[PDB]
Design a protein around this ligand. Structure first.
Ligand SMILES: [Cs+]
Ligand SMILES: [Cs+]
Ligand SMILES: [Cs+]
Length: 138
């Protein structure tokens, strides 16, 4: 049972999706930019990920800049509601598996919550080796 909140325009998100597949399952794929989680789902993802609300915030995107979110003037719920109203503020990719939930940045973070081992060596799209044929992390 695997879900990934994916942005096909993000290399980290692409590498994460292919590592999931290389573990042998095809995940449910949620295009969060167009289908964001509900407030309740988002609050749960954040809890399960064990990171702060602000840590989930994507910087260098229009609403982050124009709403001034770099400044420490926002409660967590204010930030959560900005994310729901402007889903490009949600950093990516988030992956949910039976083992847990992670913001998979960098992508190989996903190896923590995949239940089955990579079926063979994995190399990121830019050529960075992640695990070898043996299964060892590089
Ligand atoms: Cs939803
Ligand atoms: Cs694991
Ligand atoms: Cs890169």
């Amino acid at each position: 049972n695997i879900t990934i909140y994916h942005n096909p325009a993000c290399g980290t998100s692409r590498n994460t999706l292919e590592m999931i597949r290389n573990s042998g399952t095809e995940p449910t794929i949620i295009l969060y930019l167009e289908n964001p989680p509900s407030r309740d789902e988002l609050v749960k993802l954040i809890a399960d990920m064990g990171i702060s609300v602000r840590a989930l915030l994507k910087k260098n995107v229009e609403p982050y800049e124009q709403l001034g979110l770099a400044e420490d003037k926002f409660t967590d719920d204010q930030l959560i509601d900005f994310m729901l109203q402007h889903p490009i503020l949600i950093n990516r990719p988030i992956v949910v598996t039976p083992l847990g939930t992670r913001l998979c940045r960098p992508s190989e973070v996903v190896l923590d919550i995949l239940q089955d081992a990579q079926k063979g060596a994995f190399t990121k799209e830019d050529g960075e080796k992640v695990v070898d044929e043996a299964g060892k992390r590089l």
